[PDB]
Design a protein around this motif. Structure first.
Motif, PDB file in Angstrom:
ATOM      1  N   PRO A   1       0.817  -1.220   0.000  1.00 46.15           N
ATOM      2  CA  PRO A   1       0.000   0.000   0.000  1.00 46.15           C
ATOM      3  C   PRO A   1       0.851   1.271   0.000  1.00 46.15           C
ATOM      4  O   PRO A   1       1.816   1.332   0.730  1.00 46.15           O
ATOM      5  N   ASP A   2       0.461   2.261  -0.794  1.00 45.57           N
ATOM      6  CA  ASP A   2       1.086   3.576  -0.808  1.00 45.57           C
ATOM      7  C   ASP A   2       1.072   4.170   0.601  1.00 45.57           C
ATOM      8  O   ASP A   2       0.054   4.069   1.320  1.00 45.57           O
ATOM      9  N   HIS A   3       2.194   4.769   0.990  1.00 41.70           N
ATOM     10  CA  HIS A   3       2.412   5.324   2.333  1.00 41.70           C
ATOM     11  C   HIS A   3       2.441   4.298   3.466  1.00 41.70           C
ATOM     12  O   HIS A   3       2.520   4.667   4.639  1.00 41.70           O
ATOM     13  N   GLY A   4       2.396   3.017   3.114  1.00 43.16           N
ATOM     14  CA  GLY A   4       2.362   1.968   4.130  1.00 43.16           C
ATOM     15  C   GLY A   4       3.438   0.939   3.930  1.00 43.16           C
ATOM     16  O   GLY A   4       4.471   1.239   3.314  1.00 43.16           O
TER      17      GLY A   4
ATOM     18  N   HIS B   1      10.481   1.830  -9.255  1.00 43.47           N
ATOM     19  CA  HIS B   1       9.518   2.932  -9.164  1.00 43.47           C
ATOM     20  C   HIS B   1       8.262   2.461  -8.417  1.00 43.47           C
ATOM     21  O   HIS B   1       7.971   1.276  -8.352  1.00 43.47           O
ATOM     22  N   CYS B   2       7.560   3.463  -7.902  1.00 43.67           N
ATOM     23  CA  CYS B   2       6.183   3.318  -7.418  1.00 43.67           C
ATOM     24  C   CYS B   2       5.355   4.373  -8.118  1.00 43.67           C
ATOM     25  O   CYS B   2       5.407   4.474  -9.365  1.00 43.67           O
ATOM     26  N   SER B   3       4.547   5.152  -7.389  1.00 40.68           N
ATOM     27  CA  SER B   3       3.830   6.261  -8.057  1.00 40.68           C
ATOM     28  C   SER B   3       4.694   7.551  -8.055  1.00 40.68           C
ATOM     29  O   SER B   3       4.891   8.173  -9.083  1.00 40.68           O
ATOM     30  N   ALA B   4       5.206   7.967  -6.906  1.00 40.16           N
ATOM     31  CA  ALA B   4       6.029   9.199  -6.861  1.00 40.16           C
ATOM     32  C   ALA B   4       7.515   8.867  -6.968  1.00 40.16           C
ATOM     33  O   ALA B   4       8.337   9.764  -7.212  1.00 40.16           O
ATOM     34  N   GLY B   5       7.847   7.589  -6.753  1.00 39.90           N
ATOM     35  CA  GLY B   5       9.236   7.101  -6.751  1.00 39.90           C
ATOM     36  C   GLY B   5      10.130   7.531  -5.595  1.00 39.90           C
ATOM     37  O   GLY B   5      11.331   7.773  -5.779  1.00 39.90           O
ATOM     38  N   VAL B   6       9.547   7.559  -4.408  1.00 36.22           N
ATOM     39  CA  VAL B   6      10.264   7.933  -3.184  1.00 36.22           C
ATOM     40  C   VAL B   6      10.080   6.983  -1.999  1.00 36.22           C
ATOM     41  O   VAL B   6      11.032   6.647  -1.286  1.00 36.22           O
ATOM     42  N   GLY B   7       8.851   6.562  -1.723  1.00 37.78           N
ATOM     43  CA  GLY B   7       8.640   5.888  -0.453  1.00 37.78           C
ATOM     44  C   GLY B   7       8.819   4.395  -0.563  1.00 37.78           C
ATOM     45  O   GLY B   7       9.765   3.845   0.007  1.00 37.78           O
ATOM     46  N   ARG B   8       7.920   3.721  -1.262  1.00 42.50           N
ATOM     47  CA  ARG B   8       8.080   2.294  -1.481  1.00 42.50           C
ATOM     48  C   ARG B   8       9.362   2.016  -2.231  1.00 42.50           C
ATOM     49  O   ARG B   8      10.103   1.066  -1.924  1.00 42.50           O
ATOM     50  N   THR B   9       9.621   2.879  -3.204  1.00 42.72           N
ATOM     51  CA  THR B   9      10.901   2.781  -3.948  1.00 42.72           C
ATOM     52  C   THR B   9      12.120   2.865  -3.036  1.00 42.72           C
ATOM     53  O   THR B   9      13.026   2.020  -3.100  1.00 42.72           O
TER      54      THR B   9
ATOM     55  N   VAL C   1      12.239   6.852   1.432  1.00 43.41           N
ATOM     56  CA  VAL C   1      11.652   6.225   2.667  1.00 43.41           C
ATOM     57  C   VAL C   1      10.736   7.305   3.278  1.00 43.41           C
ATOM     58  O   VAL C   1      11.154   8.155   4.062  1.00 43.41           O
ATOM     59  N   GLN C   2       9.500   7.292   2.825  1.00 44.38           N
ATOM     60  CA  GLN C   2       8.652   8.474   2.843  1.00 44.38           C
ATOM     61  C   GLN C   2       7.878   8.593   4.169  1.00 44.38           C
ATOM     62  O   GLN C   2       7.411   9.687   4.534  1.00 44.38           O
ATOM     63  N   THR C   3       7.719   7.483   4.877  1.00 39.55           N
ATOM     64  CA  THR C   3       6.994   7.508   6.153  1.00 39.55           C
ATOM     65  C   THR C   3       7.820   6.886   7.283  1.00 39.55           C
ATOM     66  O   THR C   3       8.697   6.046   7.068  1.00 39.55           O
TER      67      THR C   3
HETATM   68  O1  VO4 Z   1       4.272   5.889  -4.743  1.00 40.23           O
HETATM   69  V1  VO4 Z   1       5.614   6.018  -3.618  1.00 40.23           V
HETATM   70  O2  VO4 Z   1       4.487   7.177  -2.478  1.00 40.23           O
HETATM   71  O3  VO4 Z   1       5.660   4.891  -2.291  1.00 40.23           O
HETATM   72  O4  VO4 Z   1       6.801   7.259  -3.620  1.00 40.23           O
END
Ligand code: VO4
Length: 281
Positions: free
Chosen positions: A181-184, A215-223, A259-261
């Motif tokens: 999950p995004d942000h999770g 990649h994910c959607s923004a390419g920062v957190g899950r990535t 690592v967004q969260t």
């Molecule tokens: O789509 V990601 O919010 O995990 O950067």
């Protein structure tokens, strides 16, 4: 200051300390990483010609580390990221938009990419996160000057592996993790550990490859969490210490919000805890 290396025999206790008093010290550490890399500009990403090329107007590559397309027509929302063993070990990027998927594949071709890791679904709870930027079945399609055709697809419960042939002028594997999950975080540590180990096995079998795309959607957190786990697992297999802080610090020097969260930062520690328990046992 940049690095917090923990002896493997001390990690279990270190993580308990971090978790004490409702994550007091873990929170303090994660907050410190917030400032890393923050002196750097993203002017190119902000150019008016480029506005339509960013999925999120506030998640943009640093000028210093962005990936350039051959030639502003050189712009894509993507950044080079160092790993355990070389400085451009990964390219991280946003989830391609319908109007940038041709740019995405041009990048893949130009950078000699053989492995792409995707850690988002295309649509999550009805919010669009990523265009379906590859062919849907075995029928071929053009993307700019390239032609792509899917050669195989293996669906498993938690991920799907596809292989494409690309013609330009190569085989590309795509690893699609479908339960994050995004942000999770994933439901278990075992699931992502197994996924990372699998992709690393393929990367190790990819003589000649350029960077691995993640990649994910923004390419920062899950990535970023995926890359951090890939790097720390290699540390564990080769080294007497593990440095989660230092990995996340190096990522942040190269792209915003990696690592967004805070839960993702906790999750990295839980994965390392779980691996070390299994080992020193
Ligand atoms: O789509 V990601 O919010 O995990 O950067």
């Amino acid at each position: 200051k940049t690095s917090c290396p923990i002896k493997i025999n001390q990690f279990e206790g270190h993580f308990m300390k971090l978790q004490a008093d409702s994550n007091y010290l873990l929170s303090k550490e994660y907050e410190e990483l917030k400032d890393v890399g923050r002196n750097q500009s993203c002017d190119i990403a902000l150019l008016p010609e480029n506005r339509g090329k960013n999925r999120y107007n506030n998640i943009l590559p640093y000028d210093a580390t962005r990936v350039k397309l051959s030639n502003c027509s050189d712009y894509i929302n993507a950044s080079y990221i160092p790993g355990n063993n070389f400085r451009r070990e990964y390219i991280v990027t946003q989830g391609p938009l319908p109007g940038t998927k041709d740019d995405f594949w041009k990048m893949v071709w130009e950078q000699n990419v053989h492995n792409i890791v995707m850690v988002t679904q295309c649509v999550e709870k009805g919010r669009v996160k990523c265009d379906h930027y590859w062919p849907a079945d075995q029928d071929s399609l053009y993307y700019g000057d390239l032609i792509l055709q899917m050669l195989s697809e293996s669906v498993l419960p938690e991920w799907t592996i596809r292989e494409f042939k690309i013609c330009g002028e190569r085989l590309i594997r795509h690893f699609h993790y479908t339960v994050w999950p995004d942000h999770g975080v994933p439901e278990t540590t075992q699931s992502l550990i197994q996924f990372v180990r699998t992709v690393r096995d393929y990367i190790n079998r990819s003589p000649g490859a350029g960077p691995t795309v993640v990649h994910c959607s923004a390419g920062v957190g899950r990535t970023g969490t995926f890359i951090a786990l890939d790097r720390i697992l290699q540390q564990l297999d080769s080294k007497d210490s593990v440095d989660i802080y230092g990995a996340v610090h190096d990522l942040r020097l190269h792209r915003v919000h990696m690592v967004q969260t805070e839960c993702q930062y906790v999750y990295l520690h839980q994965c390392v805890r779980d691996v070390l328990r299994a080992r020193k046992l």
